[PDB]
Each structure stands twice: as C-alpha cells, then as structure tokens.
Copies of this chain bind each other. A is one copy, B any other.
Amino acid sequence: EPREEAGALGPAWDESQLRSYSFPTRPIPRLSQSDPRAEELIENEEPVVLTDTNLVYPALKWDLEYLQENIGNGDFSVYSASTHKFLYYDEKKMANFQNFKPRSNREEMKFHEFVEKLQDIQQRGGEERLYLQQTLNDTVGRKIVMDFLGFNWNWINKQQGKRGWGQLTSNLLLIGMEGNVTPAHYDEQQNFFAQIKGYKRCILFPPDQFECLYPYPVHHPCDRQSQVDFDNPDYERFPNFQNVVGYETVVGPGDVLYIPMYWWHHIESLLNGGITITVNFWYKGAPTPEYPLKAHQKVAIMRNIEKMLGEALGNPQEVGPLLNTMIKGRYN
C-alpha cells in the first residue's frame, strides 16, 4: 500500500492506478544496502528492493527536457504497441514460424522527434503507447556521459565480485508512458533494475512456476515469454495458471530491484503517473560447479533438450511431434 513522500506531498501512488489480475501476490522486502538480510537474499537468489544504493544518483534529475537538451542528436530505437501490451519478438527466429506476423515494431528517430510524437499521443487520447531503449555509452551526449560516470560503480563492481558473477554484459535505459505493460518473461542473466523517474509495478514469479506459466517453445520468436494473457487467461489450455502466486512491489526513484536470473517478471507503469525512466544492469551468473537440482537448472536442461532436438532433427517444427511421441502412453 502507497508510500508517503517527504515534505507532506501525499501518497506516491494509490491502488486505483494498479491493474487487476487473477492471482494472489505477496511483497518483496525493501531493505538497506547495509542490512545483512539484503546480502542474504541476493546470495540465495531471491529478489529484494535496495532503497539507498545511490546507484543512479545523478540521473534523478533526468526528465524529457533535460534529456532533449543534453542527450545529443544520435538516433534512438523507439518501440510502439497499439494496446498497452508490448509484444516483443526475436527477428532471427521468424524463419522457423511463418504464421508469426510482427505485432509491435521499432522506429528510429532523433530524441526530440520521439518527444514530439509522445506528447502528441497524450493530449489526444491516442491508444498508442511507446517505449524508448538505449544502451548507455560514449555514443551519447557529453553531460549524459558525466551523469553515467557518476553512477555508483563502486557499489556495482563490489556486487559483481562478491557473488562471483561475470562482468556487466550490458545496461539499458528505458523511458515509458503510463499504462505500459511488458508481459511476463524471464532472462538468463542476473538483473539490477534501477528506477529513476516515475513508479513501476513489478510482479515476479520464481523459476519453479515454469509449469504455471507456459513459455513459448524455444524456437518461437517469443521464447522466454509466457503464453498466458494475464488480462484474459485461458484456463482450458493453461489450467495451472490458476495456481500461480507472485511476488510484487512498486519501485520508485532511487530504488533498485534485484531480479534474480530465471525469475519471471511482469513490469507495468502505473495508470496515470506520467512517464517512467529506468536503467537495468545485467551480469552473467557464476558458472556451475552436485545435487539435488535447483529449479533454474532444470529449466536450462529443458531449453537444451529443445535446442538439441531442433538440430538433430534438422527442423524446429519436428520438435513437438517427437516429444509427444516420446511421451504418450509411456510417461503420461
């Protein structure tokens, strides 16, 4: 339930700006970077919200004006969806499935063009929604590079070492519009999700809920996303979505959410809070050293069987018929 901002300025959000769903949730713990319980959650690959890392301190001033004015006239990838749901897809995997037609889609543009096209949509009710995505690097304007240089690298490098993770594999700046949903998917990397402006609602489900969540086949362009439409679940095809339980929280500026590798996450911008900015940091996990097996490890074995079988068979379409044949009246 809503958090009270300093200086008597009222609740940060109210529950009328959250969407409704069929399943129960419980809260993710908010803690201090210095609380041993925090380090104990990360260590066990459980999510925690850290409230005082200062990870993105100098980015707290970012808004659209400040960015238009300083980010420099390179081109930026802007994605569009027609409803509130952003459907993403791996273009490389479209060969495999020719009845897949693009749903969301990408435009390039200068930043001010994006801004122009944004404010346009707003004060005309347009149902269109946008997300901007940019890796932070030297290819962006000087002031923004100064801002990026003052992030808490010392905090963020200490975590890389401590956990025995590999190196930062990438990072990504996301700017969104109120109402935006990124539907449930999982990633193979460890993720710190650093909120900068606005509030985001994050629903998480652990690896052992694979069976409730029904990911697309590995060769499908939506590999790692869930087949279940949360807004209208088909209990006939996905009967165990009825048993799903999630973990939830609302992050705001200066909060950092740890999304452990293979954890499902569903991410939405509140209804009517204005725009959101977020930066994610991704690390490869520690490599595998052995029993008895964690859920994430059994997920990787499923992925691998589906990948080998695609190869051995010479064609991704035969994967399903083989698995069924293997089975049917034998293990079911």
Q: Which residues of B contact A101 (CB under 8 A)?
A: none
- Contact assessment for B319 and A227 in the assembled complex, using a CB-CB cutoff below 8 Å: no
Q: Which of A59-67, A122-130, A320-328 lies at the interface?
A: A320-328
**In the complex, which residues of chain B have a beta carbon less than 8 angstroms from the beta carbon of A291?**
314
* B313 x A309 contact (CB < 8 A): no
Report the stretch among A145-153, A207-215, A253-261, A270-278 that lies at the interface. A207-215
B305 touches A309 (CB 8 A): yes
Tell me the smallest distance from the CB of A48 to a CB of chain B, in Å. 28
Tell me how far the C-beta of A49 lies from the nearest C-beta in chain B, rounded to whole angstroms: 30
> Out of B216, B298, B320, B322, which one reaches A322, CB within 8 Å?
B298
Q: How far is the CB of A149 from chain B (nearest CB, A)?
A: 45
**In chain B, what residue has the closest Cβ to A237?**
B329
Chain B residue with the shortest CB-CB distance to A236? B329
Nearest to A292 among chain B residues (CB) is B314
Could you say which of B292, B319, B326 contacts A323, with CB atoms under 8 Å apart?
Answer: B326
Interface size of A by Cβ–Cβ distance < 8 Å?
Answer: 35
Given contacts A309-B305, A314-B293, contact A324 B329 (CB under 8 A): no
> Would A210 and B325 be within 8 Å (CB), given that A217-B330, A309-B301, A331-B319 are in contact?
yes
**A23 an interface residue at 8 Å Cβ cutoff?**
no
B residues less than 8 Å from A293 (CB atoms) = 313-314
- Closest chain-B Cβ to A126's Cβ sits at a distance in Å of 35
Is the pair A215, B305 in contact by a Cβ cutoff of 8 Å?
A: no
Residues of chain B with a CB closer than 8 A to A322's CB: 298, 301-302
Residue A6 at the chain B interface, CB threshold 8 Å: no
| Residues of B close to A45: CB separation below 8 A | none
Residue of chain B at shortest CB distance from A329: B214
